[PDB]
Write an enzyme that holds these catalytic residues in place. Structure first.
Site, PDB file in Angstrom:
ATOM      1  N   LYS A 156      -4.409  -0.166  -1.707  1.00 53.58           N
ATOM      2  CA  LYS A 156      -4.065   1.068  -0.941  1.00 53.58           C
ATOM      3  C   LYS A 156      -4.957   2.264  -1.252  1.00 53.58           C
ATOM      4  O   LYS A 156      -4.508   3.439  -1.171  1.00 53.58           O
ATOM      5  CB  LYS A 156      -2.591   1.464  -1.093  1.00 53.58           C
ATOM      6  CG  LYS A 156      -1.625   0.288  -0.887  1.00 53.58           C
ATOM      7  CD  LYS A 156      -0.209   0.705  -1.092  1.00 53.58           C
ATOM      8  CE  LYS A 156       0.338   0.308  -2.483  1.00 53.58           C
ATOM      9  NZ  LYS A 156       1.695   0.774  -2.477  1.00 53.58           N
ATOM     10  N   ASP A 192       8.073  -1.676  -5.538  1.00 54.62           N
ATOM     11  CA  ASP A 192       8.885  -1.046  -4.507  1.00 54.62           C
ATOM     12  C   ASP A 192       9.774  -1.988  -3.730  1.00 54.62           C
ATOM     13  O   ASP A 192      10.983  -1.678  -3.390  1.00 54.62           O
ATOM     14  CB  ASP A 192       8.123  -0.031  -3.622  1.00 54.62           C
ATOM     15  CG  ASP A 192       6.790  -0.543  -3.071  1.00 54.62           C
ATOM     16  OD1 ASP A 192       6.186   0.192  -2.195  1.00 54.62           O
ATOM     17  OD2 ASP A 192       6.372  -1.698  -3.410  1.00 54.62           O
TER      18      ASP A 192
HETATM   19  O1  LIG Z   1       4.046  -0.315  -1.474  1.00 55.99           O
HETATM   20  C1  LIG Z   1       4.097  -1.395  -0.493  1.00 55.99           C
HETATM   21  C2  LIG Z   1       3.266  -2.512  -1.152  1.00 55.99           C
HETATM   22  O2  LIG Z   1       1.900  -2.074  -1.076  1.00 55.99           O
HETATM   23  C3  LIG Z   1       0.816  -2.970  -1.405  1.00 55.99           C
HETATM   24  O3  LIG Z   1       1.210  -4.257  -0.872  1.00 55.99           O
HETATM   25  C4  LIG Z   1       0.962  -3.212  -2.927  1.00 55.99           C
HETATM   26  O4  LIG Z   1      -0.017  -4.176  -3.521  1.00 55.99           O
HETATM   27  C5  LIG Z   1       2.426  -3.665  -3.132  1.00 55.99           C
HETATM   28  O5  LIG Z   1       2.591  -4.148  -4.459  1.00 55.99           O
HETATM   29  C6  LIG Z   1       3.572  -2.758  -2.638  1.00 55.99           C
HETATM   30  O6  LIG Z   1       4.764  -3.616  -2.739  1.00 55.99           O
END
Ligand SMILES: OC[C@H]1O[C@H](O)[C@H](O)[C@@H](O)[C@@H]1O
Ligand SMILES: CNc1ccc(Sc2nncn2C)cc1C(=O)Nc1nc(C)cs1
Length: 448
Positions: A156, A192
């Site tokens: 991200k 999350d």
């Molecule tokens: O935040 C939403 C998701 O974003 C990207 O997939 C991250 O690698 C992940 O771990 C998190 O669960």
């Protein structure tokens, strides 16, 4: 039209979705087994969250959330309800995250996080409690335990140096201790997805999947300990963090991927990684639209052949614009105002084309994402025996929650792909804070 043919490249037939579903389930299987875990694109990470919780601590808890664009610090209070533990956020504050920290070193960034924690505890009469702290850290992590695991890699756009490969929770600890100001018992770290799932438990015990469709996109779910090979033991269930965002990184999506997807990728912080999330998540949606809009203008189909300087800069078509354009009522009034802000002066037909383009990207995201989820839910069907599987999926994320019709296309399509499941969708209330803290509370029963 030369338009409709260009947009039509986004469509996915029913057999397309099923193909991606079946391939995803396979990758899930491979991530779980000892022979293939190391090299699996969908890592399937044990989280050490476990079934039958069986009583926890109560009272106040402190939760952090890093991985949203902001970073959030909150106090959550946990008591006893009949079902299991209630919980409720009682104080909260966001903190922007300066790019001099973000490009920093790891220990810098966790110093910035440490500063934010003290700030929050001043402003609240609080420095003098040592509180138990649940940490929602939304990045891939290989755990050794509920309170220890390494960052596998950042996603991200995050990039702080020297964090990949170290004990994220130890980072937090060496920053809290590295600044004397306060005492914090870091009892629990969670993704999350897991936090969201867990916070839906009080009102619905069938909630066994959590999903985020936000900046990024991922899910986690409850697996049978027998199938989790990387954690010794066969009894009960452990939540697994599929990290599905990375499906496609071993070329599983090559046939579906598009020139626009090839360009969002190359130009990203993390080229060649997180390909599936790149088709769905909010960090990328606006940008896919921007590139579709640029191809229409270079074909002369849009803004007749000319684009403002803004339209041509990476990043300018914000994901939130994708969802405002699809909310236009038909009067073009807010399509007009967005285009007018990016320095364009669109015609009637420009506005319609632009709307068609947003629909095309967002409908594809919704569909691609429904295939991952039906992959996970049909795997769970396999392990199970009532003639109809009833299951609840907890969800969070601005794309799923706020985009005008993503959730419904997405529900319609998960349901085509899941015969003889009955699925309930719950939008998590304060999933990340209360989640961390709900887990923290049970982790505490094993230490204090
Ligand atoms: O935040 C939403 C998701 O974003 C990207 O997939 C991250 O690698 C992940 O771990 C998190 O669960
Ligand atoms: C309220 N907390 C939980 C609620 C449910 C579940 S699993 C389940 N059962 N039905 C549905 N779901 C998702 C696990 C937890 C939990 O926190 N477990 C933990 N284990 C350790 C070792 C630390 S925290």
């Amino acid at each position: 039209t030369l338009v409709e043919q260009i947009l039509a490249e986004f469509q996915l037939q029913e057999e397309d979705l099923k193909k991606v579903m079946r391939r995803m389930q396979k990758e899930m299987d491979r991530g779980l087994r000892l022979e293939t875990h190391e090299e699996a694109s969908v890592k399937m990470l044990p989280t050490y969250v476990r079934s039958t919780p069986e009583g926890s601590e109560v009272g106040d808890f402190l939760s952090l959330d890093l991985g949203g664009t902001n970073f959030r610090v909150m106090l959550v209070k946990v008591g006893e309800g009949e079902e299991g533990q209630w919980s409720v956020k009682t104080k909260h504050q966001m903190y922007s995250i300066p790019e001099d920290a973000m490009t920093g070193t790891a220990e810098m960034l966790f110093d910035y996080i440490s500063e934010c924690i003290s700030d929050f505890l001043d402003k609240h009469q609080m420095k003098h409690k040592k509180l138990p702290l649940g940490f929602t850290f939304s990045f891939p992590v290989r755990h050794e335990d509920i309170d220890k695991g390494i960052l596998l890699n950042w996603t991200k756009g995050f990039k702080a140096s020297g964090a990949e490969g170290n004990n994220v929770v130890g980072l937090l600890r060496d920053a809290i201790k590295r600044r004397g100001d306060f005492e914090m018992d870091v009892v629990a770290m969670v993704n999350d997805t897991v936090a969201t799932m867990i916070s839906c438990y009080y009102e619905d015990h069938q909630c066994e999947v959590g999903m985020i469709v936000g900046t990024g996109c991922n899910a986690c779910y409850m697996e049978e300990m027998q199938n989790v090979e990387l954690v010794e033991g066969d009894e009960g269930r452990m939540c697994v963090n599929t990290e599905w965002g990375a499906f496609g990184d071993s070329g599983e999506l090559d046939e579906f991927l598009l020139e626009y997807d090839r360009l969002v990728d190359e130009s990203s912080a993390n080229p060649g990684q997180q390909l599936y999330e790149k088709l769905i998540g909010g960090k990328y949606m606006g940008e896919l639209v921007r590139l579709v809009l640029l191809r229409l203008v270079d074909e002369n189909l849009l803004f007749h052949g000319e684009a403002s300087e803004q339209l041509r800069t990476r990043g300018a078509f914000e994901t939130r614009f994708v969802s405002q354009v699809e909310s236009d009522t038909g009067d073009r009034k807010q399509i007009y105002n967005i285009l007018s802000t990016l320095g364009l002066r669109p015609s009637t037909t420009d506005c319609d084309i632009v709307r068609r383009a947003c629909e095309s990207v967002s409908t594809r995201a919704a569909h691609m994402c429904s295939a991952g989820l039906a992959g996970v839910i049909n795997r769970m069907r396999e392990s199970r025996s009532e003639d109809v599987m009833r299951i609840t999926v907890g969800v969070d994320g601005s794309v799923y929650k706020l985009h005008p019709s993503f959730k419904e296309r997405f529900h319609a399509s998960v349901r085509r792909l899941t015969p003889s499941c009955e699925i309930t969708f719950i939008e998590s209330e304060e999933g990340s804070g209360r989640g961390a803290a709900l887990v923290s509370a049970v982790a505490c029963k094993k230490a204090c």
